[PDB]
Amino acid sequence: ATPACFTIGLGVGALFXAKFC
């Protein structure tokens, strides 16, 4: 879901977890 599929909880892992963590 492009930006709509950012993820309120996990989204961080996919988004923030993608470069970080």
Side-chain angles (χ1 to χ4, degrees), residues 1 3-6 8-21:
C5 273
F6 156 35
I8 292 167
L10 92 77
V12 63
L15 152 133
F16 166 80
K19 40 258 184 178
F20 298 92
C21 78

